[PDB]
Amino acid sequence: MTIVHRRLALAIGDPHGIGPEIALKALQQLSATERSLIKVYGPWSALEQAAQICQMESLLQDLIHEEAGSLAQPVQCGEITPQAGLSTVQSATAAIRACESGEVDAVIACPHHETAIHRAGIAFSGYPSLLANVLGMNEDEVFLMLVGAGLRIVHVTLHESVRSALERLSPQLVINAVDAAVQTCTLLGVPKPQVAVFGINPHASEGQLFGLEDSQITVPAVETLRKRGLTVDGPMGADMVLAQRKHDLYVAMLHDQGHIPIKLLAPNGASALSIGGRVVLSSVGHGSAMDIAGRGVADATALLRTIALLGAQP
Amino acid sequence: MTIVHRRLALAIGDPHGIGPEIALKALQQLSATERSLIKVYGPWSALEQAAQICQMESLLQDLIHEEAGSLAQPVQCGEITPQAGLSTVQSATAAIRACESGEVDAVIACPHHETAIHRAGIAFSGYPSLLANVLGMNEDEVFLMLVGAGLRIVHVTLHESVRSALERLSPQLVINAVDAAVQTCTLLGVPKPQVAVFGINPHASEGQLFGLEDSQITVPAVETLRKRGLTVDGPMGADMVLAQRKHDLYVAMLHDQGHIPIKLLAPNGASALSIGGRVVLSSVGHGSAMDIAGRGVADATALLRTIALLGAQ
Amino acid sequence: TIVHRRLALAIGDPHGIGPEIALKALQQLSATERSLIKVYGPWSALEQAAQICQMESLLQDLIHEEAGSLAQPVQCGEITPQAGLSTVQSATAAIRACESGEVDAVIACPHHETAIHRAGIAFSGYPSLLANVLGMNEDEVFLMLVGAGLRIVHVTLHESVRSALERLSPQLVINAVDAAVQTCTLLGVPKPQVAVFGINPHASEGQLFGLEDSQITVPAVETLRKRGLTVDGPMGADMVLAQRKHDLYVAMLHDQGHIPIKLLAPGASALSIGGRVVLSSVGHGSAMDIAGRGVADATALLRTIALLGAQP
Amino acid sequence: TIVHRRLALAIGDPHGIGPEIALKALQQLSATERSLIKVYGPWSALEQAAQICQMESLLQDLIHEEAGSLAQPVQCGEITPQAGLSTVQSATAAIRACESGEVDAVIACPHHETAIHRAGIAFSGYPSLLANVLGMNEDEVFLMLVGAGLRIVHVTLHESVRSALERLSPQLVINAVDAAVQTCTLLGVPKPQVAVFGINPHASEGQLFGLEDSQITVPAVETLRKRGLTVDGPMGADMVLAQRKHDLYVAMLHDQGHIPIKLLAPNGASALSIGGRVVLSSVGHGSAMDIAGRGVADATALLRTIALLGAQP
Numbered sequence A: 001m002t003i004v005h006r007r008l009a010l011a012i013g014d015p016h017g018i019g020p021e022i023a024l025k026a027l028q029q030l031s032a033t034e035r036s037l038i039k040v041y042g043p044w045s046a047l048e049q050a051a052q053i054c055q056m057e058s059l060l061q062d063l064i065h066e067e068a069g070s071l072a073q074p075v076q077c078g079e080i081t082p083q084a085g086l087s088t089v090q091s092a093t094a095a096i097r098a099c100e101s102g103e104v105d106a107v108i109a110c111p112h113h114e115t116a117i118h119r120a121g122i123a124f125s126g127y128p129s130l131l132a133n134v135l136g137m138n139e140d141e142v143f144l145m146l147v148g149a150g151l152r153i154v155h156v157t158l159h160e161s162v163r164s165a166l167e168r169l170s171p172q173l174v175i176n177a178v179d180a181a182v183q184t185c186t187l188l189g190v191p192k193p194q195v196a197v198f199g200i201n202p203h204a205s206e207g208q209l210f211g212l213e214d215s216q217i218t219v220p221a222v223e224t225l226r227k228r229g230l231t232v233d234g235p236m237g238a239d240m241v242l243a244q245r246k247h248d249l250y251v252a253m254l255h256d257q258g259h260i261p262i263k264l265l266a267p268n269g270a271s272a273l274s275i276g277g278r279v280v281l282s283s284v285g286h287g288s289a290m291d292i293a294g295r296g297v298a299d300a301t302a303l304l305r306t307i308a309l310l311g312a313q314p
Numbered sequence B: 001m002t003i004v005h006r007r008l009a010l011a012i013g014d015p016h017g018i019g020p021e022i023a024l025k026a027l028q029q030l031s032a033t034e035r036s037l038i039k040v041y042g043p044w045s046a047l048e049q050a051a052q053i054c055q056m057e058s059l060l061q062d063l064i065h066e067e068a069g070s071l072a073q074p075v076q077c078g079e080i081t082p083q084a085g086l087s088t089v090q091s092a093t094a095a096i097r098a099c100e101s102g103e104v105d106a107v108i109a110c111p112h113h114e115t116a117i118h119r120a121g122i123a124f125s126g127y128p129s130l131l132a133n134v135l136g137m138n139e140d141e142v143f144l145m146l147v148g149a150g151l152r153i154v155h156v157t158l159h160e161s162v163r164s165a166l167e168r169l170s171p172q173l174v175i176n177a178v179d180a181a182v183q184t185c186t187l188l189g190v191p192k193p194q195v196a197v198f199g200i201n202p203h204a205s206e207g208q209l210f211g212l213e214d215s216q217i218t219v220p221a222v223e224t225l226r227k228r229g230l231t232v233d234g235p236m237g238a239d240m241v242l243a244q245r246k247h248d249l250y251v252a253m254l255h256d257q258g259h260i261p262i263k264l265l266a267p268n269g270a271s272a273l274s275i276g277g278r279v280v281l282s283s284v285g286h287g288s289a290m291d292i293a294g295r296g297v298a299d300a301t302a303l304l305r306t307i308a309l310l311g312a313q
Numbered sequence C: 001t002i003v004h005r006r007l008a009l010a011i012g013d014p015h016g017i018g019p020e021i022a023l024k025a026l027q028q029l030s031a032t033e034r035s036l037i038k039v040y041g042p043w044s045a046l047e048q049a050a051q052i053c054q055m056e057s058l059l060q061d062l063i064h065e066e067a068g069s070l071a072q073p074v075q076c077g078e079i080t081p082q083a084g085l086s087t088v089q090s091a092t093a094a095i096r097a098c099e100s101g102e103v104d105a106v107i108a109c110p111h112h113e114t115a116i117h118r119a120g121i122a123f124s125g126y127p128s129l130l131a132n133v134l135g136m137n138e139d140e141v142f143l144m145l146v147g148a149g150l151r152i153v154h155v156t157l158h159e160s161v162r163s164a165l166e167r168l169s170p171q172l173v174i175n176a177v178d179a180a181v182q183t184c185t186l187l188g189v190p191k192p193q194v195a196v197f198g199i200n201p202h203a204s205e206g207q208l209f210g211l212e213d214s215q216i217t218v219p220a221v222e223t224l225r226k227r228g229l230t231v232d233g234p235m236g237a238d239m240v241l242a243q244r245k246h247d248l249y250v251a252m253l254h255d256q257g258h259i260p261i262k263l264l265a266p267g268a269s270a271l272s273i274g275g276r277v278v279l280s281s282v283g284h285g286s287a288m289d290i291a292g293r294g295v296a297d298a299t300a301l302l303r304t305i306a307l308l309g310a311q312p
Numbered sequence D: 001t002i003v004h005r006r007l008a009l010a011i012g013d014p015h016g017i018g019p020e021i022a023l024k025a026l027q028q029l030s031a032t033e034r035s036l037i038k039v040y041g042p043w044s045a046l047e048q049a050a051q052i053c054q055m056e057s058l059l060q061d062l063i064h065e066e067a068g069s070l071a072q073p074v075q076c077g078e079i080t081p082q083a084g085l086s087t088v089q090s091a092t093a094a095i096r097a098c099e100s101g102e103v104d105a106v107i108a109c110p111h112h113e114t115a116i117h118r119a120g121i122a123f124s125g126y127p128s129l130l131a132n133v134l135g136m137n138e139d140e141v142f143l144m145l146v147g148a149g150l151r152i153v154h155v156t157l158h159e160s161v162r163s164a165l166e167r168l169s170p171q172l173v174i175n176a177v178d179a180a181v182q183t184c185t186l187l188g189v190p191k192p193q194v195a196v197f198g199i200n201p202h203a204s205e206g207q208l209f210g211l212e213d214s215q216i217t218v219p220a221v222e223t224l225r226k227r228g229l230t231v232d233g234p235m236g237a238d239m240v241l242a243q244r245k246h247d248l249y250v251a252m253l254h255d256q257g258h259i260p261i262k263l264l265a266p267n268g269a270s271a272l273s274i275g276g277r278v279v280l281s282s283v284g285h286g287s288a289m290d291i292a293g294r295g296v297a298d299a300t301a302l303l304r305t306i307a308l309l310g311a312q313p
């Protein structure tokens, strides 16, 4: 029945795509108490436009809203414009800032459009980067946790070469990833998670038979984490520990380790959470669907599920 | 409750887009009796794929299906491929042929993707063209009737320049449009419709103060239609006769005459019917939404409304 | 307060409902508002109307200029050449007062075509009458319909589609927009968002459905933007109207503009725009059958006053 | 040294001369002074301006907050809805920074009314904009002109004389004085000697030339003295200005205040919009689109505005 148990910022994404409309449909389906926990970031004009089209004007009065990504002309649904690109980023930036300040506890971004953003002259390569930039952090102090099919997997490294990732790995980097992911687990409604750390090398180096990295990196880090009072197994061969399927959070050393399981088991319904400082940002997992914008064919299921995920009860 | 009272062919459109998905969601909402009146044309594989995503396997057994637009390799949701273009057209072609043969009474096409069809090497300019080709007809024996907000408007011309349209207009062309649209009215559940013919010129030439075209074209055509026993008023200024809102079918000379009223009053309740021989094909009036395809977020409302429209006695 | 500039009100056919509705509309305004509206017509018709409606004391507070004086008593309902001449004389004096700058716009109460024709006067609409009075070509006067929030100016009107197409030029489109933009200021939208309709369906769709748009509407839009106007198009009229997000639409052809307006509004106001003069009709007939029983509705007049009287 | 407090500088229309004069003014200050002025506007406009004015070295040590970001490159001299939005976004961020206490006053560089109108934003002056932003009634925000030693706050502005007279109340005069007295502190006159103008000639001369003064200015003066303020009047505006012994005059009507200021300072007046704790001043010249890009605009009026709002005590 009730899926929102905390304060959330909802950025409406590209004001020309389906974001505004699915934002309205999602809020519609919530109770009044739930609506008052969701603060919406975007141009009012886009939500007004969307509301006209969907015949949901009565909903706009009950909306907590902060203007962001104001446009200089009316909304043109379905058009890829530099303006809507700037809007998108301005909206997500204001949502993120509200999370950073403590006004909300997590962020959801509705679908952007990469081309719209590029044509505005703005570099954008994903939510992990955007979040890093906005919070004044290096991109490797923001981590991606994939969630799907009961698996939660945080990545100690991400979009770089295997060699570069290996060169970056340190006991402290693993610890930062776990800390950030454990906090995120609390949000997702698992206060005391059972954690498994993947091995850098096959079979977690098998002692030191298949490299020194694990004895230098994952083994010390696990020890420090146990000492701080966490329930951590490993390191263990990723293949082996995932198979057991008895942990609430897995810690993957490399992109592929985490991404393969998630995409294989949850190919149509996974959430990608960017975690940095106190900020948890998730997307909706789908594009802006320009050709159906304002055409009343998009439903809010994926958004609602994302809300359910970040909005779970302690 | 129930909206399907006749036999319908449902072509699932681009097997990579949202067509399969919305096909399943629409059929879900119907009773078993209603499901058995909709025969589905498309690759089984795409419906299987869609069923996985929506968790609606239980529905596939109760589905009247004819394989069409088979794919030789798996469904890849969200990709624009020549293969999915050919599939689209093959499915719609099989649905159309089923209507032509009398196996069904009308066709609904789920959303195509123009680029997918173009990349297959197939010329495509709309359902009117496709229907013409398939039924062995010239393009100006197939007419577009828009439906929404109580308005039904058939177009004597469509998708050409005003000049070109005027050069084409003849008493006979107007007659063919009305005939086709009158038959279609029976399908839509209005046996004996009251017809209003738009004037070519403002105020239907206004006693020929504003051109001779109406006296050459619309006036003779109206006469012939009355003589054949039809209830036809006009020609009349389109602006004037639409305002009265007391006709079951309007006959527009030019695209804009028909399209403006429909889209102004119903910008997302518009059905576009291609009418040729005994075949009525309606689209769903939205794209294939590649960005959400296989993401389980697609609404079947527009399809359901199309079904309600073609489905009444 | 609905009257925020000076208006000339021509009472139209002195035998129809015009005088009567002129009085009833002024009645409903404050005294301040009454003094902004100067009335053009035969005093005798206003006196007649006032007697019937029992509104004599309102005639004293009226700014009036005699025009279209009658030679005999008022005969309500009756079509006479005299009432035809009166009509035209009244509207001519209202127009001239606008042209001179004495008022800021004109409202004409309902005429009667037959009355005017029987007087020997050629008359084909307010566009014509305005053109002839101001010494202009009839193709420099444009009609803008206003109703249900829609404002639509017509680049052509009241000729065959073929004839209209033969006339259309980049310059003619530009004149229509200019005239309509100025008019928008009066209506209380100084800097409007403009949509230009395509000549051909889908505005020719590049050049796939004719060359007209690439030759006519496309250059004209590119002059208008350059001069600093907020103009979208050309676009398929059907598409752009549907969105209902522009303050002024520019129609190439009568039907394009007239269908939307008449479908959404049972009334509409029709503004004839020429030079600096905006003349609006009251959008209904002279209603000869109900003239002078003191039962006539001034609502349409009041709405026309509200429209042309709007705040900057 | 002319900057003795923290100031927000909104760079106005990013397409006009605002960014350019912003740079030239900051150039003329010491480094210490520069660090007291926080600049609000699109970085891209400042980058453009820096190229033109050959002041790249100034950009790195500049206190800047991005505001009114553009979605496309800067086009000097062009009136665009985008630059209109930028203007207002920048001024809104400067105002918000003053409201929060981050700065002590705001200077707005020249806007362009047409650019703002074309963006769909209602704009009738800085008084309006400030009212909207601060969640205040538009008639709780007052304009004070400053020039040639005259400071004059206006109880009304920018409406018909009749309309102004209909609005005047004891309370409105009181609000004007209060707002202006606070502003006086900023300008470096903590405890000013105030003169209230009469509505009517000779302040009505008792009641001989109208009742308004006895009903409006006389009670208001009484209440202000009672609250502990040093206030003379009401007196004929012509008479009290002549005495030239007050630190602040209170005008009932636009022309009462505007005539003296513009006669004595026809080129060098500052217009301060005063609302809540926010003081916003314009630069009192336009955006000069004709010369934007050409690096030939004088920053004197800006520097003078800075000197005024940046004053010592």
Ligand SMILES: O=C(O)c1ccc(O)cc1O
Pocket: A126, A127, A128, A144, A255, A259, A272
């Ligand atoms: O590889 C991906 O699918 C991917 C996409 C987006 C993102 O933030 C992180 C990812 O690993």
Ligand SMILES: O=C(O)c1ccc(O)cc1O
Pocket: D125, D126, D143, D157, D271, D282
């Ligand atoms: O009328 C003016 O001179 C004027 C100009 C700018 C401003 O902000 C306020 C004003 O009264």
Ligand SMILES: [Cl-]
Pocket: B254, B256, B257, C253, C255, C256
């Ligand atoms: Cl037409």
Ligand SMILES: [Zn+2]
Pocket: A159, A255, A259
């Ligand atoms: Zn990746």
Ligand SMILES: [Zn+2]
Pocket: B159, B255, B259, C201
């Ligand atoms: Zn079309």
Ligand SMILES: [Zn+2]
Pocket: B202, B203, C158, C254, C258
């Ligand atoms: Zn007409």
Ligand SMILES: [Zn+2]
Pocket: D158, D254, D258
């Ligand atoms: Zn002024």
